[PDB]
From Swiss-Prot, chains A, B:
Family stated for the protein in its record: Belongs to the UPF0309 family.
Organism: Streptomyces coelicolor (strain ATCC BAA-471 / A3(2) / M145)
Superkingdom of origin organism: Bacteria
Any one GO biological process: D-glycero-D-manno-heptose 7-phosphate biosynthetic process
Gene Ontology MF terms: carbohydrate derivative binding; D-sedoheptulose 7-phosphate isomerase activity
Name of the protein described by the UniProt record: UPF0309 protein SCO4393
GO cellular component entries: cytosol
Taxonomic lineage: Bacteria, Bacillati, Actinomycetota, Actinomycetes, Kitasatosporales
Pfam families: SIS_2
Coiled-coil region: none
Domain SIS: 33-217
Length: 248, 248
């Protein structure tokens, strides 16, 4: 009955929905990532604002793939920007996504994961459209409910999911808040990061397992806060350095 | 049996452990945050690397408290820094934590949440020690198992949890990886961000509910990606601007 327990039960239920409903889509996404690695492509992940956090959770990560890179749009990497409200405004700027994609090392055949809960703003929609125009395969992580219950803010009138090769439905109801209190007019307690991080790990875990099943050793990193982790990672990062862009 | 399902079941089980084991600690932490707001103090959250992501998840957040601020240590806000490996090295630098605390607006009586899974490195340990020396109340979000199974890398030989007023145990087993495959030597698939984000939301949800029960309207933000959210937030951010440091 207490707020902590109510929220955790809501987050568990959302993870159960993802587990039971997105299993095939999660498998398809992880296989696409494994295919890209095997065929010599690169892997990148992007999200704006708090959606950036699920993307960061698979980059340079204990237990994660060394080959996963972060696509950084300046000002929307998390909420670090001053003022934080500018991050919201940058999501409406046409041409930012193309500037970032055209400057990056992404090329035809690469894989880009795009996390956007609403999927409705110019920046994530343009990112998917332009990435596909460049020949990239695009996985979207998005709450498809928003496409029926909100209006697109992109000039095309379309949503992120309309421009993805694979869509992972992150389930969050419109408003991104799981609890209400009678005395309190606004809902509170967002689970979207709990859910999207879990989806991303499920996707990358599938890619690692798929490579292994094909007799290809997945390039996995260890935690740097367990003795020997940094030594282990140095070997891996050097080995796959050519397709890793967060070190040299 | 598939990797996605195995990971999601592991993450659910960790959320159940937090729900069933940390309920009283979560209540105590949220009450301390509510007490601080009521007594006129400020709220800040910090973590390094991927632990920064749980801190960011409660800042400028749909359904979250407008009064929660991010404490930014340059170079360890997420994994954005180039090269990402420098973030790991910065966690070992003595004096960085004090530099950041002494420059910030944090003052005696304020509340600081510190997220560190291992709790073993110089930066998070110094952050807690120096914050308490400044008169701050400190909530740590940390896997206490690390304090018995790893060695401290702080000069004191102590861990984060030894310097907290309240400890929230994030349960993750040493290594931060929930899956193994027979052919694959390293474990993979980290849940720490799934778990820590959920703990943080449970804490802030408790603070909002506690304020409400005391007849104090919690200063909650709405999603900017639902129509009217930015207008709603502008009112709130102006009202509580004096204790909000991510806008002006
Ligand atoms: C109060 C608030 O909402 N702040 C931002 C929001 O402006 C931004 O749009 C979202 C990412 O957008 P997306 O996940 O829907 O793509 O992250 C944050 O929530
Ligand atoms: C491969 C790797 O591990 N990268 C960093 C790690 O160096 C850092 O220590 C941790 C935060 O540390 P903490 O959560 O234990 O405080 O975030 C990331 O995992």
């Amino acid at each position: 009955h207490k707020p902590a327990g109510q929220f955790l039960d809501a987050a568990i239920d959302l993870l159960r929905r993802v587990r039971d409903e997105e299993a095939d889509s999660i498998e398809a996404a992880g296989t696409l990532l494994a295919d890209t690695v095997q065929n010599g492509g690169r892997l990148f992940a992007f999200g704006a604002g708090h959606s950036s956090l699920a993307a960061q959770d698979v980059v340079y990560r204990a237990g994660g793939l060394a080959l996963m890179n972060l696509l950084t749009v300046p000002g929307v990497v998390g909420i670090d920007v001053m003022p934080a409200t500018l991050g919201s405004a940058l999501e409406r700027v046409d041409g930012l996504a193309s500037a970032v994609l055209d400057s990056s090392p992404l090329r035809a055949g690469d894989a880009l994961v795009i996390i956007s809960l609403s999927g409705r703003n110019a920046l994530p929609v343009e990112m998917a459209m332009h990435a596909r125009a460049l020949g990239l395969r695009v996985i979207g992580v998005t709450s498809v409910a928003y496409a029926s219950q909100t209006t697109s803010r992109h000039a095309s009138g379309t949503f992120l999911k309309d421009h993805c090769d694979i869509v992972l439905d992150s389930k969050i109801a419109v408003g991104d808040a799981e609890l209400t209190l009678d005395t309190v007019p606004a809902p509170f307690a967002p689970a979207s990061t709990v859910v999207t991080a879990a989806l991303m790990q499920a996707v990358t875990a599938t890619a690692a397992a798929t490579l292994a099943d094909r007799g290809i050793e997945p390039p996995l990193l260890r935690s740097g806060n367990v003795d020997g982790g940094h030594e282990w990672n140095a070997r891996v990062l050097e080995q796959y350095g050519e397709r890793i862009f967060y070190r040299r």
